[PDB]
Amino acid sequence: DGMGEEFIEGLVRDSLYPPAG
Length: 21
Fold this sequence. Notes:
- The chain contains no helices and no strands.
- By secondary structure, it is low in regular secondary structure.
- The PDB classes it as unknown function.
- Keywords: lasso peptide, Sphingomonas subterranea, brevunsin, unknown function.
């Protein structure tokens, strides 16, 4: 994702929640 604090978004950093639905 970029701006978050969940976990490494594959190849970025602490993601947030891109997938929802």
